[PDB]
């Protein structure tokens, strides 16, 4: 497809929406940069990773994930095997070639039209079944590893669990979760502060435990659509066009990316902080902890200390759970991490505990998290808005949560412009408005 | 002839128009771009603010700025050959100077350029109106780079011709003039902001009510450069917002005009407002409140709650921002909440 | 009739109802009707609010001592932060009152129905049959309002710090921010102030030219504006004699003959910058504040040379220090 009988150059890829895609290969083409990117950055990451320096202190976005899966970590968040990390990127990277080596082909030297070579499932969008069946494959596909993980979780090594008895430590998920109330129950859970429907997740037992449920649930869908044709209220409802398909599909990411950005900023479970930074709230709670100690250790009663405002410095009271750290810190009385849970109580933070059972391993982890906080400039000078240049550090969470939002946002912009242009074919006014047959120049004037 | 030869020549087409105007536009305008540029790259601004203002010194894009004359000069045009500098392009480059330069040379570039908008306009049989709209900036640039400073103490407190150095110009107002709370400035954002929407909307509102009069996926070519044919159904317009927003921009002379107004107007309201700041006539005031701020130590509005931020902005920056006063604030005198 | 709803179905989608009300309509329409109603009153007459983590009530109602500018309906308190404080969770009506529960109502509501207007912004472009990359323009706006009311809150953990609904409130939300994010030095906001300034300049540009090459149809006594009728077939302006001018006025080729392109440039510029901006807030929402060059320029001995940004930062501390005096019960403003 040349120029005329196509779109302009900036809308290049549109002429590939014509006939049967000359290349799946485009999608595969990059389906490689994406896997190759892991190959580079992963290599690049370890390429800069020191074992002592806290993983999050060394701009490690990629590497922390391997660790979170149980690889190259063990006792504490300490890294013992520089090898495993290296392994994964080396593989992917190389792995990308095959992915690109092929996409690169499918786009120039193969069937410029697989609509004809069709046969094998083949091509054409309106074809309501070739599409039900296709996604169908990719459905068995995903659930496939849902288990892959369950395996790593239950049969190959385990994952990293900060909660895990002793302390952060590679552990094997023995007993995942059965009860559907729990695993499913999260969706029905509050969306707001106190209980995020997805985010709120104390342990791995519910994670890997839930994933299982998703693998099968998801596989049952591929098995499903692959066998049948969508009902009539479905057809009636949704526009079918190659574009329109991207249109929907694309707005599942938008949402999802937010769901990530909103997740990587909030959880200490699936994002341990020993690999990522301490979570925003954790921080302003960590500060609390450090100073509750500083004075209590300096000889202050703490619990009974009337604070400047009228509330009390070290300890304050929340409406539902009775006891938590007080400052402006209150906003985060929902924060939960292993470094502060021992000093917990029935009614809330326990005065008796906090006063005498508050051990040392906490004052030091508490101080690391007080410092290392999700605060920094693009400049990358970690700290308050107005800090001197010196200590620099930007939380993995900062970059992670931030990016995905801007992207996921932008995508939502996409879900629109691709639905806006596609809902248009539906009647044909997408090219414009016909100069001699426009609905409005022939309609009852509003008044 | 003798004049008309100069005219005849400089007046006709030749790509980059050069007119009766150009004579002052081009020269002033050039120097000006240069004036600012040289400073950012090579000129220092230390001998006026004890602050580094050049790539050469190590400053970055957002740092570099062409100073502004120490509070020792005041409003003296600070002439290259004037008593102060005495044609000593290094000292004159040191006592700041480039400022008055950039600013004054510049001040003409505008005068000059607007003229050009007239010249080319009266020559092409159009309504100058564009040239008028352009007051919008002259007024601003006049008030904000000459009037305000001229009203205060020295060229010093005048804008900074910087990226960040100019951001300072903000805060400093918020902090001392508490501009943010000045009606006039308000319409200033009411117009810019209000206008931007007006722009972004007419632009898109138009695009969508475009008659498919081309073939395919390129409604960008399907348009006729040649003749009259309403490209955007004005009818598919009103009957749209009339039902989606309740109102209809029925006409295009006014629409495409009201867009001229919005900004230009607000700008003026800004230029007025700042004129105020010139003679320290500012809207910080708000008695009704402050009078009752005395007693009732427990009543609090954002106004006050905000006004307080300002009061901090003073106490902390003044000492380093206004160096020529050799301010000294002991550890104690500085206002702070319980904590930091 | 076979079913009576049949009429409800065409009415909602009445392509001719004075004011279109789509399916989004049916949610927008009231979500804002309730949202507005709570508002208009909260302003006119509503008690103070402990806002900040303490028990310092901030008054923001005309009947409680507010000039139209000082006016503002205040946020929810650091006590609730993110928890959902709906009218029923509060015991006494007055609780919701004090702990600043109107906010959530007003915010959550408009902030919602707003989007549906965004939908119903396009739903008319479908029933009307017009290209619809229009509703998107509206995004940038809604994004920000969403950013300043929903992201930033989730970012800092409390609706406490979400641009308080009111005039002087915004000013507050602002000055504070600069302090904690140096927003002004943020590459995004730039691209924001970029377009806004642009659009506001283009809005006067494109509006300028058109009226400048307007065309013939009037006396001097008559209003030149009258020369045109709704539903004209040919545009009123003489585009050729316009580009023929503007183009010339510096460069000739930095001009637009492609009316479709130009009107387009107007769309995207404002709408794109504004986005970055909307993202700027949403960016620093999780603390990826603007740049920072404090002490970044030094000499040999190390004696420090203040960058023109160090002043920025100086005036910044003046801000940091004061904001929210009493609560801040610790060295680091970690929130």
């Amino acid at each position: 497809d040349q120029e005329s009988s196509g779109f302009a150059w900036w809308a290049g890829n549109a002429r590939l929406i014509n006939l049967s895609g000359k290349l799946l290969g485009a999608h595969v083409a990059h389906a490689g940069l994406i896997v190759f990117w892991a190959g580079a950055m992963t290599l690049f990451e370890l390429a800069h990773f020191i074992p002592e320096k806290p993983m999050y202190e060394q701009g490690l976005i990629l590497i922390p994930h391997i660790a979170t899966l149980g690889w190259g970590v063990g006792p504490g968040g300490e890294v013992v095997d520089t090898f495993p990390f290296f392994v994964v990127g080396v593989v992917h990277l190389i792995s990308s070639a095959v992915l690109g080596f092929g996409g690169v082909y499918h786009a120039i030297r193969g069937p410029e039209t697989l609509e004809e070579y069709s046969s094998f499932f083949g091509y054409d969008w309106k074809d309501k079944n070739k599409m039900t069946t296709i996604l169908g494959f990719h459905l068995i596909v995903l659930g496939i590893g849902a288990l892959l993980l369950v395996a790593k979780a239950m049969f190959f090594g385990g994952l990293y669990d900060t909660w895990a008895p002793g302390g952060g430590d590679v552990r094997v998920i023995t007993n995942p979760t059965l009860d559907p109330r729990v695993i499913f129950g999260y969706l029905l859970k509050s969306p707001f502060g106190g209980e995020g429907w997805i985010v709120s997740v104390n342990n791995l037992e519910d994670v890997v435990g839930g994933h299982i449920w998703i693998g099968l649930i998801c596989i049952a869908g591929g098995i499903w659509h692959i066998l049948t044709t969508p009902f009539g209220w479905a057809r009636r409802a949704f526009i079918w066009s190659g574009e329109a398909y991207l249109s929907y599909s694309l707005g599942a990411l938008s949402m999802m990316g937010f769901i990530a950005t909103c997740f990587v900023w909030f959880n200490n479970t699936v994002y341990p902080s020993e690999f990522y930074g301490p979570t925003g709230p954790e921080a302003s709670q960590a500060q609390a902890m450090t100073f509750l100690i500083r004075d209590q250790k300096l000889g202050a009663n703490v619990g009974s200390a009337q604070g400047p405002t009228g509330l009390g410095k070290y300890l304050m009271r929340s409406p539902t759970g009775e006891i938590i750290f007080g400052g402006e810190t209150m906003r985060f009385w929902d924060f939960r991490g292993p470094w502060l849970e021992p000093l917990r109580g029935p009614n809330g933070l326990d005065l008796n505990k906090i006063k005498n059972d508050i051990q040392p391993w906490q004052e030091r982890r508490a101080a690391e998290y007080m410092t290392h906080a999700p605060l920094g400039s693009l400049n990358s000078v970690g700290g308050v808005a107005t800090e001197i240049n010196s200590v620099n550090f930007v939380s993995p969470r900062s970059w992670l949560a931030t990016s995905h939002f801007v992207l996921a946002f932008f995508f939502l912009v996409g879900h629109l412009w691709h639905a806006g242009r596609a809902r248009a074919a539906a009647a044909g006014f997408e090219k414009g408005i016909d100069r001699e047959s426009e609905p409005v120049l022939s309609m009852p004037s509003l008044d | 002839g003798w004049f008309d030869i100069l005219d005849d020549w400089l007046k006709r087409d030749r790509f980059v128009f050069v007119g009766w105007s150009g004579i002052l536009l081009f020269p002033c305008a050039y120097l000006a771009l240069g004036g600012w540029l040289t400073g950012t790259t090579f000129v220092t601004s230390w001998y006026t603010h004890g602050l580094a203002s050049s790539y050469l010194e190590g400053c970055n894009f957002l740092t570099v700025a062409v100073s502004t004359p120490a509070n020792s000069m005041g409003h003296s045009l600070l002439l290259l050959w004037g008593p102060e500098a005495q044609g000593d392009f290094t000292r004159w480059c040191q006592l700041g100077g480039l400022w008055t330069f950039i600013a004054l040379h510049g001040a003409f570039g505008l005068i000059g350029f607007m003229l050009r908008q007239f010249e080319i306009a009266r020559l092409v049989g159009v309504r100058p109106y564009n040239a008028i709209a352009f007051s919008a900036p002259i007024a601003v640039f006049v008030s904000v780079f000459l009037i305000y400073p001229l009203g205060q103490s020295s060229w010093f407190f005048a804008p900074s011709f910087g990226v960040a150095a100019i951001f300072r110009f903000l805060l400093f107002f918020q902090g001392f003039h508490n501009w943010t709370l000045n009606p006039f400035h308000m319409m200033g954002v009411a117009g810019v902001l209000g206008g931007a929407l007006l722009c972004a909307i007419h632009g898109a509102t138009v695009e969508n009510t475009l008659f498919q009069d081309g073939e395919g996926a390129s409604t960008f070519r399907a348009f006729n450069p040649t003749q009259a044919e309403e490209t955007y159904s004005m009818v598919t317009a009103n009957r749209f917002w009339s039902q989606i927003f309740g109102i209809a921009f029925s006409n295009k002379r006014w629409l495409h005009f009201f867009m001229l107004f919005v900004p230009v107007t607000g700008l003026w309201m800004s230029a007025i407002g700042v004129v105020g700041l010139a003679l320290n006539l500012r809207s910080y005031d708000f008695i009704s409140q402050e009078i009752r701020a005395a007693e009732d130590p427990e009543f609090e509005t954002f106004y006050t709650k905000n006004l307080l931020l300002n009061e901090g902005i003073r106490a902390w920056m003044a000492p380093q921002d206004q160096p020529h006063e050799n301010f000294v604030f002991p550890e104690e005198v500085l206002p702070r909440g319980n904590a930091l | 009739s076979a079913n009576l709803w049949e009429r409800f179905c065409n009415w909602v989608t009445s392509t001719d109802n004075r004011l279109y009300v789509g399916w989004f309509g049916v949610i927008m329409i009231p979500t804002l009707l309730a949202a507005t109603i709570c508002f208009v009153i909260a302003f006119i007459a509503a008690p103070p609010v402990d806002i900040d983590g303490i028990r310092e009530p901030v008054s923001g109602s005309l009947l409680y001592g507010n000039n139209i500018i000082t006016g503002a309906v205040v946020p929810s308190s650091n006590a609730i932060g993110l928890h959902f404080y709906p009218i029923w969770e509060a015991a006494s009506l007055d609780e919701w009152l004090y702990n600043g529960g109107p906010y959530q109502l007003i915010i959550f509501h408009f902030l919602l129905g707003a989007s549906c207007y965004m939908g119903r912004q396009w739903e008319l472009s479908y029933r009307l049959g017009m290209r619809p990359w229009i509703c998107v323009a509206y995004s940038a706006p809604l994004a920000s309002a969403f950013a300043v009311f929903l992201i930033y809150p989730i970012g800092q953990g409390s609706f406490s710090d979400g641009m308080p609904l009111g005039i002087s409130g915004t000013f507050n939300f602002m000055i504070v921010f600069q302090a904690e994010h140096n927003i002004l030095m943020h590459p995004f906001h730039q691209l924001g102030v970029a377009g806004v300034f642009g659009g506001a300049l283009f809005c006067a540009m494109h509006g300028s030219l058109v009226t400048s090459s307007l065309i013939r149809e009037t006396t001097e006594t008559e209003s030149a504006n009258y020369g045109y009728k709704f539903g004209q077939e040919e545009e009123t302006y003489n585009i050729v004699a316009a580009h023929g001018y503007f183009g010339r006025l510096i460069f000739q080729y930095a001009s637009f003959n492609n009316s479709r392109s130009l009107h387009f440039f107007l769309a995207a510029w404002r709408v794109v910058g504004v986005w970055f901006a909307a993202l700027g807030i949403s960016t620093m929402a999780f603390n990826l504040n603007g740049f920072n060059f404090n002490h970044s320029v030094i000499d040999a001995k190390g004696n420090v040379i203040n960058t023109w940004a160090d002043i920025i930062n100086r005036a910044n501390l003046g801000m940091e220090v004061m904001h929210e005096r009493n609560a801040h019960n610790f060295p680091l403003d970690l929130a």
Binding site: - | N238 | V40, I44
Partner: peptide, 30 residues
């Protein structure tokens, strides 16, 4: 007192919305 002045404006304006939308001079297609 002055707060009625605020509310009076605020209101008569909502009604300038009434008329300008519903008793507004209509668009004549000719």
């Amino acid at each position: 007192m002055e707060t009625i002045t605020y509310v009076f404006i605020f209101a008569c304006i909502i009604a300038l919305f009434f008329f300008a939308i519903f008793f507004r001079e209509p668009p004549r297609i000719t």
